[PDB]
Design a binder for this molecule. Sequence first.
Ligand SMILES: COc1ccc(S(=O)(=O)N2Cc3cc(C#N)ccc3N(Cc3cncn3C)C[C@H]2Cc2ccccc2)cc1
Ligand SMILES: CC(C)=CCC/C(C)=C/CC/C(C)=C/COP(=O)(O)OP(=O)(O)O
Ligand SMILES: [Zn+2]
Lengths: 403, 315
Amino acid sequence: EPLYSLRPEHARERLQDDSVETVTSIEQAKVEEKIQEVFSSYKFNHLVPRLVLQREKHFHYLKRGLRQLTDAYECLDASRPWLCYWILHSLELLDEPIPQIVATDVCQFLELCQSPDGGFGGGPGQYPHLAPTYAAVNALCIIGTEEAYNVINREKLLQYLYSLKQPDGSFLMHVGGEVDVRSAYCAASVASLTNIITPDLFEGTAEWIARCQNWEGGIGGVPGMEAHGGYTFCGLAALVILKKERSLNLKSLLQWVTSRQMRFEGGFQGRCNKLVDGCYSFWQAGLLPLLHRALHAQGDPALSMSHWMFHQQALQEYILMCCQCPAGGLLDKPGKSRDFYHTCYCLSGLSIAQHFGSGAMLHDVVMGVPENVLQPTHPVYNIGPDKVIQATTHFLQKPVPGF
Amino acid sequence: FLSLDSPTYVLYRDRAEWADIDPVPQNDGPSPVVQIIYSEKFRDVYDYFRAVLQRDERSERAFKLTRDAIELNAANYTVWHFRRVLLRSLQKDLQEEMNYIIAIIEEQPKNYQVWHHRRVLVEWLKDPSQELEFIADILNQDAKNYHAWQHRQWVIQEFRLWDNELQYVDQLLKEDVRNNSVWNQRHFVISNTTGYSDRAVLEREVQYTLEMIKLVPHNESAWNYLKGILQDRGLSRYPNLLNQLLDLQPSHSSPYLIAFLVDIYEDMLENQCDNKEDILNKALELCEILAKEKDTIRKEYWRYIGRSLQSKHSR
Ligand SMILES: COc1ccc(S(=O)(=O)N2Cc3cc(C#N)ccc3N(Cc3cncn3C)C[C@H]2Cc2ccccc2)cc1
Ligand SMILES: CC(C)=CCC/C(C)=C/CC/C(C)=C/COP(=O)(O)OP(=O)(O)O
Ligand SMILES: [Zn+2]
């Protein structure tokens, strides 16, 4: 009744520090203490809680950011296509259409970020890198107009991607960079949406990804690294795309993610014994729609047909209560500053938590007012499942261009 | 030489040294999107960086300019690239560059490029001698820095510097037994030195975890470790384990214990053990104690665990 986080039973899900204080315990208590202040404020103020997604405030924030950013964002000056992605995805999520005007100005911007030899750099005249290539392609697909699709040089892109492929399956982040699970995902994501996949392009790649799965259940950034939130997403989503979901111990993984939801806060941590953060609303919780399609495509008849295997409600409550800026925009956790990153991923994670799909069965869980419902997101590409349709459909009208 | 923070700092456009070269403004286009409103300082460095890049000027001045450009956006991998082109063309002393990167990581330890640059130098020099002490210093200020662990793993592997690392683990585990990076490292060493599928060590290990989990019963890290170093043999090949946990259910209870008790029964059941239809109860039960009372954040997990069992261990 009716909010999970506000229930009196919930006082129990607070941290038992065993009497043994470490840095880890002290810092989690600090966070729990802040979060409790948020949960409790309704009681202490004597109002009824009503959870509302500040759509119009978020929308003015993103509208403006899409054109101009403060020098706060100097640190993202080599990530400009990411900004396009984050803002345009948040807007699509908020069901705010993109003016043909802005579509075309994103287009020409990204053209400028396009490298002669393929890939996109982090801004005009920057060398190409896979991360901004991924962002670029996604943002191009979100826009989904022929002009946007025509920006992408698929021949070159396929050349660039080969330039990065390594012997052992892995992909460099960029020329004279090093490998990381993120890069196989960026490669796999962009390769598919644009159709330039060849038989030998991802040859080696799944087994390299499975090497990253560690003893904890999750995937680390390279073999031997601790399991971590957004790298786990990259690996599974990379595999899903290749169809090697096969190669992981999905049960050990399933079980790692699920343990990542914080019993008190309701959101996810990225690593065991670290703090909650709203962006893992997507990176951690977006694993379940992938583990669903997977455990299903392997016959698991114990799978739910109504709900994902995480607490959808508490996630929404965390996001809606703890991660919104009143002035619009979303945050990692309370007391932090808004940014377009956390706006993108808190909203994408909100969407996941709201929408269960499974072959046939569509079922929603919308905390708060009905207006809180977001447009759905594709858990592999984190763009609208429509923009994906409309993209791949197109790029199958073309043959896989080799080198 | 002239620091970005200096009160004397002067814009490049005002510098005599730089007169021959015309800045290259950013080609953002007729009607920019995600246009960042740069400080005049940022704009100025990067206008000149663009100039030295497009000209591919391999000079001592282009080199110094990379320093400022880095300080202002250390995620700019185009600058780092050009800097390494410049270290190699200008034949710069790589220890001095190693000194520089020490300092920058110290200031921005969460930046990926900066660690990447340090690996490259270590590989150029083929000298790991400063690393473990260096990385230890970063870990002394943030003991879960991912890149710092990733650089440590890399160093240790590539140059085979294992011999004093479990000692480092113990040190750190005893500083903070809840640090999952240090548990993970423990596992990285052991599986890379002695091993677990050994019989004698699997056992100082299994041992030690239980002794921490006694000190701090709600430390998920240990439980995942203990679970980690057994689950691939089968938890049910260790029958004493069960009884030894069932000791602490009254005194040291946790959802992790119960959660672990359940993993055993699945393994037990998966092998035909004794009381297949019986054991299926103690567990199915435990799934509902978890889903309804002690671990409700995972109800959807547990409701599914109680039931994939039925799916497979039914009739
Ligand atoms: C907060 O000052 C910072 C800190 C880091 C960075 S960053 O290293 O360049 N980058 C992108 C990022 C962008 C924004 C925004 N706008 C905010 C944060 C953030 N982080 C850091 C972060 C996010 N959640 C918690 N943390 C600490 C992720 C990171 C890496 C990343 C890139 C692409 C896709 C996924 C992840 C930029 C700004
Ligand atoms: C497609 C692509 C390039 C995806 C990248 C996904 C990715 C790496 C996501 C995680 C980002 C994040 C919150 C990092 C923080 O590390 P930290 O150690 O500070 O955070 P922690 O305390 O949560 O572990
Ligand atoms: Zn975050």
